[PDB]
Design a binder for these strands. Sequence first.
DNA 1: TACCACAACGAGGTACCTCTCCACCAC
DNA 2: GTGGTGGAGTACCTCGTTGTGGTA
RNA 3: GUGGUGGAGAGGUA
Lengths: 241, 84, 48, 193, 1338, 67
Amino acid sequence: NPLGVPSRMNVGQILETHLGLAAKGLGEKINRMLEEQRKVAELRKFLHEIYNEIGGREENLDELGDNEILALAKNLRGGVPMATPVFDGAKEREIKAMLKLADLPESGQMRLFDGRTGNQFERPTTVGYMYMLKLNHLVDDKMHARSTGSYSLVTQQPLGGKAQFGGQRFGEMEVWALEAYGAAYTLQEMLTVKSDDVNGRTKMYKNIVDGDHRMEAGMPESFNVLIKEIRSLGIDIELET
Amino acid sequence: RVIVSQLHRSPGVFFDHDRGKTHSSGKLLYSARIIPYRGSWLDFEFDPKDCVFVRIDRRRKLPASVLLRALGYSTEEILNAFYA
Amino acid sequence: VDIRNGKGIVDDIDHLGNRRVRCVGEMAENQFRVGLVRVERAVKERLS
Amino acid sequence: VSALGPGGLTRERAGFEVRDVHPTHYGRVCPIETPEGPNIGLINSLATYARTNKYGFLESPYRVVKDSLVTDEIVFLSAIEEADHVIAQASATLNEKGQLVDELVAVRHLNEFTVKAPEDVTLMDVSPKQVVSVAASLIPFLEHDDANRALMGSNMQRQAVPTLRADKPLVGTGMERNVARDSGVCVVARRGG
Amino acid sequence: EFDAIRIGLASPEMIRSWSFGEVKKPETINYRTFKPERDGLFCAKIFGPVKDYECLCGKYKRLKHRGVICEKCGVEVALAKVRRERMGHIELASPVAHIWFLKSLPSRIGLLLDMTLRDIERVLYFESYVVIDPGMTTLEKGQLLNDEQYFEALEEFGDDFDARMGAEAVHELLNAIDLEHEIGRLREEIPQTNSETKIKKLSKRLKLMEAFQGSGNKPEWMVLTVLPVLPPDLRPLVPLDGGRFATSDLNDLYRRVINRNNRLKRLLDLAAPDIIVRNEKRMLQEAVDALLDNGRRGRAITGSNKRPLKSLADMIKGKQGRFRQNLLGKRVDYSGRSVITVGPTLRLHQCGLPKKMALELFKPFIFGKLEGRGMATTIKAAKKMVERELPEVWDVLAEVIREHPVLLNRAPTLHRLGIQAFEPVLIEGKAIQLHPLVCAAYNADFDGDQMAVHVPLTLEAQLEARALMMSTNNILSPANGEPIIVPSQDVVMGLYYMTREAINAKGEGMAFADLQEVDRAYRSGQASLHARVKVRINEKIKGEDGQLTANTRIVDTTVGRALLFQVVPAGLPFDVVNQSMKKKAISKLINHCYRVVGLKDTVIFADQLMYTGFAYSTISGVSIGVNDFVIPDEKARIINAATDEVKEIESQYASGLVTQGEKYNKVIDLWSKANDEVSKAMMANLSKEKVVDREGKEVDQESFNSMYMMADSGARGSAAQIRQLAGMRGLMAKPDGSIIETPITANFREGLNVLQYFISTHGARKGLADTALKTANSGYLTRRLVDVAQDLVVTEIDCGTEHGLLMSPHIEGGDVVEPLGERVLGRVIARDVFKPGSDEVIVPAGTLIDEKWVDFLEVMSVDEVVVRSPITCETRHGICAMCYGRDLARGHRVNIGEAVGVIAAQSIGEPGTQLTADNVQVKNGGTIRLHNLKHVVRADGALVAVSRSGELAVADDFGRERERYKLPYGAVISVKEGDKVDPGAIVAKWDPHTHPIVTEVDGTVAFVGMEEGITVKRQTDELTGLTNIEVMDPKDRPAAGKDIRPAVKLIDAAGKDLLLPGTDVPAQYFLPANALVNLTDGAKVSIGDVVARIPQTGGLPRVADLFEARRPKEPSILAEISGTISFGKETKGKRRLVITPNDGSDPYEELIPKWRHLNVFEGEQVNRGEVISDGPSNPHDILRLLGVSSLAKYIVNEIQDVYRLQGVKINDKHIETILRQMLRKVEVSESGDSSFIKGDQVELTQVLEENEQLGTEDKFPAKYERVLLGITKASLSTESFISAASFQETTRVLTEAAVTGKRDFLRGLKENVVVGRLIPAGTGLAYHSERKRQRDLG
Amino acid sequence: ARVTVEDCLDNVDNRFELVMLATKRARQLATGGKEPKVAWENDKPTVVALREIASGLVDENVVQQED
DNA sequence: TACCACAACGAGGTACCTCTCCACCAC
DNA sequence: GTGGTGGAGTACCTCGTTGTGGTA
RNA sequence: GUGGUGGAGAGGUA
Ligand SMILES: [Mg+2]
């Protein structure tokens, strides 16, 4: 999405894409003179032309033609690896000169063709080769899902780990968001019978498999746990019935 | 496993004059801290009413005169050495 | 008293000079020293 | 290089001073490679040319420059000793004999940034990359990306996954050879043969 | 059922009633013998059976008798779960003091015993005795003494003087308290002394005694003789693989205390030495302390682990500190999560769903359906097919999914839109497909966000989701009626690109009979997407309700807009799409369509519009390349000019002519000006960067640079970001906040030097570091807000009160900040609305203001209206539906049962993350009007206004004040009231620069006491800069001149004594130091002469400070009562300026210490509401003096200033609702039915006053003062203790409940939450209503 | 069609009681004690109940009498 | 005797994922 | 394995209330 | 007629 560029002010994507397009163009080009069975002299002189252009320095004529240049061309056929330092790196005009050397459109943009309608997009677009990575955040270890399972012995509530087949915690902000809606039956349901009701979970299982959704309310055991510990704190707790 | 290099405060003396609302006034040329590589940290507080308080790391504010006397300097010899 | 009286300037903890980076050797030696003093007090209690 | 742990500030004593970059971090601690989140700035990374001192402080490399000529000698300097010297940026006009031809050259006298005259400079940096981290040195065109995106780019670079058949990046920073050798994953010739 | 949860103290008798045993063995289950031990921490004799329905020897394995207790197997056979309810006690060798009632900030026992906690701490550790039954002896009950004194007292007295030591002494004190006698003595003593502190202490003593007596609580229960034990299941020890066991901390604490109790008993029965026995008593006291709580005194530690032991208070606090995870968090079954994925082929009401998550979640539904239709007979077969996933199971899975709404929420839910319901659609994958329009509400980008899913089970819950939580239902933000399901970046880009115009494009100027013709031409490719064309169109207009008028009209438009209009529903004019269609325009169009056409058609339009925007953004080849960033050619010249100028300035500074500080400001000003010039030039270059030829002459037009559409369309980016991208980046700021004196001349396309990157790193790290702390602060603030306002719910339908808030457009400054109509939208009126000519009822009564009504008000010249507010709506326990305006998420009025408090709190707290003078110069041409102006015309008619209160309003030709200005004291104004003043005129020519002392009287004054050196000094400046006499300072004066104060006796020109109106004394104001008396003594001064001249944050912290109403360090010193002011007596150090009101002279006027500068002028009008000395504005004194509505207005304006600074828009309804929650309590002055002074709910006061009116006496009615409470303070002072218990201070609030014996009727939201009952609000309102009906009525 | 949860919400002007009556109607459907006076379009009891109330053919009197 | 410096208590964001690692003694 | 259990090493936030012993 | 997770530490994601 090009729209992600202007907000997050990182132009490196665009410059990298242009330079990678140039690199792939050069790789394809040398691939074609390699397929054209060009003599080593043509390859050597073209490579020197590449390496005399702007920066760094060439070292050819110290490499044996048939061995070193041919091995280098065979390796480079997939695209010339550019080396740009962090701040002593490639200038824009250098990329432009390389692009025009790569016989690619100067502005680094071309009009593309839609792959379904076949209609050319009216404005030329930026294409090129960008070094894309894949992070250790695959969904295969992210997709957890729980219907029912073991619960904590103290409070009969689902455990919290995808490893433990746990259920997400409806945090205190979530309940605020629920009560912001007038939805209270679902709030009471998720609070009592979906979690922390020994005599409610079994019976709503019965109801669901019977196709009824009645959901007798019940009384959470976590609250009675609080009651028991407060009583153990030497504080009299009771309900007026 | 790898051990990550810890970046910490180098032991020694450090002088602070950070302005704070503690004095409820303009500013105070605040205390100084001596930090040992191992041991207790001595702090030399500066009272808002132009006074110097000295305390151990886990001790309440005490006047520097106590430390000066404990060091053996006379109540007048220390004054003659420091104030004049 | 010089700093309070205007002579000199206060220190700045921002300077990386006022900070220092340890390395595995330093804390290894520190742990070794701690274990050493424990063994030493044990020996002194025994080898008395 | 981290600041937590024993004898170190906890995440509940964050404040701002420890979590902020200062001019003294130049060339010693990478100012942009640090995890975004609860521990930001607390846990940083050393510069590419970072160097602990005999006393455990950080030293950074610089080339001593004579008023005109840039002497090829190289010295490692700590933050406290950088006070007197006026340090010039590693990139500047040169007369092809070591003479800085620029009239007003950007410098830092006492950790403040301004321009100065070549007759006034005393030290000038080794490489521009001596400021950023190793991961920070690996992003091409880093000069064209904002600091936040640089930080995130380094962070995700830290979390890449080796593919089935790795392919060298067509665009690189030249540091890939150095880091590849320095990591032990590559079989290296102990003796020539 | 049940109700009315109670709180009380533990009576050892009823403790034993609770207990099922007396645990005597500290050890627990035997590892070697897998069994618990008799009298152990898990003894079956006490707690119950290990395995259900079994006895110790297994004598009764049968399940027939479920209650019998076997003979050899004494522990009764019973159900296994009973181990959770059964509790036991420990019999202590000695009574021990409870820590909470001792270590809470007010020491309960010390308060009951009327002396400090130092003494009880001494006695609790057997350090000092205390006299018991002093009788007729020199000793007294309160006396405490040491060992030598104890022996001497025993020798001299012998008997009738019993000295005790320890917690048992405290216990013997407690039952010897004579609560009735003590309460009577305290009541008698309370009025005897008029000292404030002592009467406060006596009041607290009386409060405690009354609470104990009414509660029936016995204070002797405070020091417990026995204590309960936690049931074993709640303190379980779990073993791990390899023979490892993991025991809870409570078990260790119990083992410790039991060990120490056994030690006590066995050393006691042999009469151990007294020192040893008291030492053991002390360690047992410390051990039980450490058990019942930790960290308060000793900070007990576990073995070989630095983590402190987690005592009971840590359990009652729950996880996450005080926000009880088990009680409120409560992880929920039938839940899952995954990463998001944008589904553009999704209708708004539907969302994607992975197959496996669907089959896992709905598994019981699958089982039910499979058994029903018959392919499942046993459930084992059903599990077999679901695990193998036959093609059959997909059919039933799709069927159950078909009409079952699913519930979705993101991780940080900041408002109810953070969690929404959808109708799931099965997809093949592992990611959750999401509707792109809803991402804005969720604030969820697809950069890796994980999205949590839930499913509602009951028909009730599914209907609640579909009818109330469906994404279609919630379109407008609850914070403000602005829509929230709005086109985001890409669809906005597509729409904006479609709605452009090219000067010379293919097919321009040719006409179309219908939109379909336009589509046919464009899809054929023979017509440009954007070319000026004509087309006759069929627009259906709803100008009059009930008849949708259709008309055809030929219109000059572009092709793209014509194509777009086919999507628009049939209730809007086509002209609403003929413009460029930017993001704000799109938002306005959506909001307009919703209020006009409806909701179903509105969402249809939204989906169609998204589809079109996506499609034509895909068609558009919009892309970003390095050539798009255009650097203006003039940038180099501007930079060179700036460099030359700064080099010249640096040379000037080096020469020494320029100082460093001035140079820094000059160079930063130069750089800022250069940056602004560069940005302006580059923006002008980019915007108009388009030259095209239209049949001959070349012309210019709007740019089509891709980044230019990205900026201008508002899809993504900002002008500041363009400035950094294609322009010089400006100044960066040092960590100290100082701007670096050297800027970044380069942009991002140019690349940056290492130094410039280093400084940008300073800035970026500043922002990133501040981000996390801002989020934490916002979270704390919103939690406090939702907790303080959770209970408030729309309960009544119409209070009918005729009080409102006189509410006007935000005019601050010379420009209109907020239009009046926008402020009043969605509200209801509080009185008649009148034409500028009176008696013309425009809007009669509390009629809801709508779009028609706001347009009507705009049609008239309405400027000020009074609207009903929740600060009004005196209804008890709730809020009426009128005084709260229209619902925000609904175009309709609110409905009874809507938790507006929670909605308000979420709305106010959601945007927390986004946070962080001489004369009067008229702006425009308008009629001049004066407001609150009190001044007498000068000799020449200058009309200098020494009055502090006064403002200038420039009324428009219509009559409304387009701008207002505040007139300072001593302001000379060209008074032409009603005469239109040209724009930019300086009508008033104030120039204080000093505190001028006006002279409303005339004549030759007599500066008496003006001693040259002792009171005054004729000190003249250089070059004859002044011919005056400067008054001598009270300290710099002579010893006798220190008391000498100059006094200009008011004499006329001939010698006639002049006196101020109202009060007989002359206007002979004293001439203090630093005054300027340039008028010659004895010179006749005209009216208004200046006698003496005396020369004179933001973000989350600011809003939090406002919501706590904290007192600033030096608040503005305000007037008490209007009248004649006086001068302050600096001799005492506090300026005592007495007030002499003309109607009645009330001398009471406090003395302001001179440490703070006071700008008040003596002998002036006091102006009760006005300010005496400047400073920040305190809230409480506005409440107690200025009133309520004034305070609400000030608070609302102060908060909305901060919010409008960041551009975030919020309706004032929410802040006003919070304000209502603040002011729920009132303080009484003279009750006649309650305590003299008490902060009690205004509902209580209203009920008591109403009862007493038609009651015992008319004089029993109470006079009370309204009191303001901060949110954290107010929430802790709720009637229901449970809510405060779950908020903070759980120890403190629990102790208050215990000592007060509080009973909580669960009549709030959070209480019904924690107990698991239905919400009192929402759909549970009917259930609560019927419950109250059946309970109260029999 | 779909649930007319907007227009029907205006008729009762509550959007809560609507849910209440809807729940009772859907329970009547599930228990089989009544017939859908709206012709089924192959969907579950909740949505047919919403259609029944939206079309205005069932209300508190109708629900009580059918009970 | 009403301010006042000083000390202590009490708060300081949600949700999720990964890893390792868990009282000593002692006849 | 089954009873039995006490201190040298550590101190490095940041407000905001709230209660307290000191002085004017 | 029966169904199996505490705490700490570190790192990471949004
Ligand atoms: Mg994200």
